[PDB]
């Protein structure tokens, strides 16, 4: 079974596109997930964000970290028309700073908090 670090990688790393990848990574085989972000950078460069700028997470906890640089990301958002089984997504490509929450030893991303 899947750890939180492994779930982060399957759902968000990728070292229309959203419809295809949401299905392949098992996000939409059994439900339609409203939003998801994929990061087009190497896994080790995203893991490196856990020792970069420490910030508060949306929830007020402090194990969040903001990347110094922008990274290539694709945002996938369900259309207002989407309904399981027919999930449908609008694909937006952008270069943004990511914010991830980190836990464990090794201290690795376990949640994608935001892009800015």
How far apart are the C-alpha atoms of 91 and 18, rounded to whole Å? 6
Annotated binding site for substrate: 7, 10, 33-37, 58, 77
Q: Residue 85 belongs to what domain range?
A: 1-116
Cβ atoms within 10 A of the Cβ of 20, count?
11
Q: What is the resolution of this structure in A?
A: 1.6
Pairing of strands 98-103, 108-115: antiparallel
CATH number at residue 97: 3.10.130.10
Annotated binding site: 7, 10, 33-37, 58, 77
HSE-up of 12 (CA within 13 Å, CB side)?
26
In total, how many domains does the chain have? 1
- Tell me which residues are annotated as active site: 12, 111
Determination technique for this entry: X-ray
DSSP-derived secondary structure for 55-80: E--TTS-S-EEE-SS-EEEEEEEE-T
């Amino acid at each position: 079974k899947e750890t939180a670090a492994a779930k982060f990688e399957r759902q968000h790393m990728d070292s229309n596109y959203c419809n295809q990848m949401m299905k392949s990574r098992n996000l939409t085989k059994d439900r339609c997930k409203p939003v998801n972000t994929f990061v087009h950078e190497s896994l080790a460069d995203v893991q490196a964000v856990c020792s970069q700028k420490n910030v508060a997470c949306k929830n007020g906890q402090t194990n969040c970290y903001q990347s110094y640089s922008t990274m290539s990301i694709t945002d996938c958002r369900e259309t207002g028309s989407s309904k399981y089984p027919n999930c449908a997504y609008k694909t937006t490509q952008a270069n943004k700073h990511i914010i991830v929450a980190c836990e464990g030893n090794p201290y690795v991303p376990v949640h994608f908090d935001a892009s800015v």
